[PDB]
């Protein structure tokens, strides 16, 4: 009934699809032996899988799934697999399973497609550890609609649910063991992976950029505004289509090649109007048949614009190219991915939100600065500078094309080869759901029954501490300035005691070797002995430091794998009732500390929970193995690096696949890296199927204890400056034993950083789980115990300089704001600062961008503060002279303030926005991204802070500006970056208008 | 005699290569 | 259409002088490139008359009003440019990888003569500061 | 310091041209007089090229966003004193220079193959008294000399003469023309028949002896094989250096093979064996040459592996998919090395031929052959 409507849409999509080159291929019958090794004999067609979709087929329709393949020769076909949807009902009284069976048999007179008896593991159930399984009624349906009828039958009961959001395509891809990006021969027996083909085929790739009209100071609205140009690229060749009703001259053919690597020969299509550009666009697309189309925010701007003008021009986008809005309003086809780069930008690029514009991503990833043009000048230029507009357009298109190809393409395409989703879905689903689905894959393959999703609304609040952060010191520390160390000699004594085993451990556990083949064991050990004894004698010392950062490698996953931690291991009112407790020794159950934090008002209560060392291991083996596969790729990577250098430089020697391979394995190991660290965050996600607040507590407390041991050692042998969650910045004495290198007997060398190994040795002495068990023989349920610990600190440095800020408040630092400098003197990270925050004074940005690099000049503290005093005095001159010593043009640019409203108009951001709303209409401020251009005015005097911003761009500036306000805000910044660390280090105020407050002098010794 | 100055371009962009006609020159 | 390249004058001057070594050729020529827009008056004849000799910023030279619009001080590779009373630019002398050529298209007669070759350039890539 | 002056108005005639080292060296050669030339086919549409005596560059203008001021030295007529303002790091002026030009773009030069504009040049089929026929048509363009032709063509002098030799350019009865393929090769065959009739040294041919050999026993008025015709055949099928000719025997035989294809096996696909027999017998007696189909690879096609039929590459479409479509209609199965010279001119990027195909058409191999199967 409703089947047949899905069949009508399916048949329309089929017509579109066949029009685009995916005819249904049905491989030949083969009654013979399904074998994967003689794959080439079996009748069928070999293909690289690039897409797959659920479908409905007529004899009401039958549900199944279409898989889309690319052949080895650049061609295409589609083929379809059918599969029955099903879900299970669990019963609480086994004795009446037959009664439940009979009940539903009657209750589900016609909705049901089939049923069958299976057994699954229940981790809450007594004697599950001896192999007792849970018995279920599997309820199957012809399609999701029937599933939905069952859920509606069940909803009043729940008022008085299982497998309800598992995507159909995911269930088939998993059960059939299918992944996009892999190679298959499609045969009657099913899909046979061709393990001989690993290298991807080459999809059809489209990149495009549009240029549109818009009204002054408002946003484009697709009901009335028009497209003025459409530029595009197909596999690195550019095209530009022009609407000569608006663009006032014919663009001629030209070349734009911004780097030799990136040739761009552009062909021009001067079309008379909008509908013609659309039809040429659709027509060219049909000509070339792309399977990826990429955009940046095309889902919210480009595409609806296309839809509304198409409707306005009587065009049917689905009929033209098979795109239509989905339930989210996004435009999707079966055959062609919509790669809106912005989602990847926001989720995966690892950039602050202040840098999520196309410009900053271009700069970061492609490394040069394309031409930029104000839209307000773009419309006049249609008449006045059409060539300039065209130069801008192609710069846009080149950046977007190569941006996708160099970063998004390897990453997304490589990740798709292990996750059973198309690229689009991997872009859009939550990372929590991503984690959930991977674990579901792993669970299904191990016959593990899925937990239902948690659904209760958030303990109304749950904002517990996840990681521990402390700001310990602020100031500049530099390798050419000497520092005082007060060494605790008893730390050195402990270290000397640990030294034979710590260094032996370093060789054999940290380095996976054997002392037997090491040449210089005793030499190294004497050298260290001498350095520690020297430090022990002269333990109050003043000399040049080594500025180090030490950071544990993959802290929480390693905590998980070492302790075999997962949510299902939490007792949950019972353990040892059915499986034997005594023979491990702690009665089987291992108690571990966590720090619980509730919000109900906040209170911490220490709690402890028991982790059975024998529970079924399903989460952790996947993570360990995944860690090993990444390590595998690091190895493979290195082998490829050797291949990448052995060979000749004649790039046309059929090794551009090898460089792609190199890139590929790089991509694969980092894709595995991101998947690895997301396994921790899943356990705190809302609606998690594997919810454990306890697990989060255990992770934070364990990491806090390891890192507190490390800070307490460095604090006894050097000076830690700042600690955030997993990193420690410290200074060590130059006489402190540092890096050495053991030589192996084969001549190979093993790297040794002695501070990292001394800490890792202590972590392994104190935090090893000696109770780690593992099924050695599952039939008899005998566990074997051993010692596991894969937690290792690594060290970076020593560095050229380090600068840490302080708060304006007493005894308080500022977290998630710091400056760090590389050995070469360059800036490594800027976190948290006003530069990153939305809405900041450009003058302040220009200030900070000037000041940071100037702290590396000079040999002393006073000279550096004098040089920064001088740049401050330049800035004091611009603001104290109210800009008079300055040309009139440079002034207006610097003072503008722009602010986003986090809500709707219905703060300083609010008042400017409100006034823009009132003046240009509430529609201006009903939406986000309103350009609020404002200054904080001197006037009205005596008015409150929320009234202080009145928009003035909307309207003498030197008397309107609250110059004292802007110099005070910059002063605040000057305080945080320059004067207050100077103040806490006892240097008298090099920027005198910001005075040392009393608290910091008192705070410090003086 | 005091209103002569330079409006600074923040960076450098090099435009698209273009064909040349005789009329582009003449 | 078609026309030969005239390079005789440049060649004769070139042969008697050494190859270009520094930023200025033995014939005394130079180029200039600025990362920015030169904000100039819309008129020129009128402002040269209010120019005083002490200032000498808008001089009159051979009946043509030349403006002394700034100063360039060349120190080795380093160069600094002060413009007017309110602008200061810090820069460098860079040697051209490809010696460019300036020439002269006599549009009147459609004749082309090679004028000169340049091997160095004086660039100012940083935002101007006041001369103080 | 240097005192900086600016003219109020720059001459836009001064423009910047990229001078590569080779261009500079050529430029710094006082020996050359008119060896460098700006050239263009027309004034409003065609590209303008830069040609040396033997090389050609295509011009590309490239705009930049900076202010570039060209200056040169001037002697200020009257002493002027500078306002010293808050100028630090600023010394006494020791030169005055004035900016006389302001250029906004650079002209990039890329080496390219010069080509002839063969717009108004007619085809000659061997008609007697052709001067009358050139006035029977309305061809306003007159080509007295090749230099005039070359001057209004986008190519270098040497490139022009080479192409002229390549296309078999001539002049008949005082009117420049291009011989039809049929009449050119027929005149060639008769010429070679005279060449074997007069026992000339094929490695040291000159114009006079050969012209005399052709027109020995025929009246000059009815002898179209003039000396200019002789010079054309020598410049087409032989190589000069006085300057004497030596025959490119495998090349001539290849031409002859193409001609044979056009006369006898164009409308029908003969098996290769019989056509080679007749072909072999078609030569003037005792001509030393053997044969292989690879010598005519790119000039014929094979419906099956053992048959041949003529195809002209010129007749193939410019667009790859169209060209492949008609190529596959002509021959279901192509050899990769056989199909490359028919598409070589479309092979602009120079890469692997299979990747070039994979944008439009797709490949499918067999044992020794690698074929392409468009859908
Ligand atoms: S603690 Fe051990 S004995 Fe007890 S239930 Fe857990 S695994 Fe079994």
Residue numbers in the entry:
A (entry chain A): 31 to 89, 112 to 212, 242 to 539, 548 to 689, 752 to 1057, 1064 to 1112, 1136 to 1186
B (entry chain E): 715 to 740
C (entry chain D): 2 to 133
D (entry chain B): 2 to 242, 247 to 380
Would you copy out the relevant sentences from the publication that reported this structure?
Ctf18-RFC belongs to the RFC family of AAA+ ATPase clamp loaders, which are involved in the loading and unloading of clamps onto dsDNA. Compared to other clamp loaders, Ctf18-RFC contains two additional subunits, Ctf8 and Dcc1, which bind to the C-terminus of Ctf18 to form the Ctf18-1-8 module. Mutations in Ctf18 that disrupt formation of this Ctf18-1-8 module result in similar but not identical phenotypes as entire deletions of Ctf18 (29,30), suggesting that this module is critical for at least some of the specialized functions of Ctf18-RFC. It has been shown that the Ctf18-1-8 module binds the N-terminal catalytic domain of Pol2 (30,31), the largest subunit of the leading strand Pol ϵ, and that this interaction increases the clamp loader activity of Ctf18-RFC.
We next investigated the mechanism by which the large interaction interface could adapt to the conformational changes of Pol2CAT that would occur during DNA synthesis. As we were unable to solve a DNA-bound structure of the complex, we instead obtained clear insight into how the interaction behaves in different Pol2CAT conformations by refining a second lower-resolution (5.8 Å) cryo-EM class (Class 2). In Class 2, while the majority of Pol2CAT remains in the same position, Pol2THUMB has undergone a small movement. To maintain simultaneous interaction at all three patches despite this movement, the entirety of Ctf18-1-8 has rotated. While the central highly specific interface is unchanged, the Dcc1WH3–Pol2EXO interaction is completely altered. This plasticity can be explained by the non-specific and electrostatic nature of this interface. We show this is achieved through an unusual protein–protein mechanism that utilizes flexible electrostatic interfaces to enable high binding plasticity.
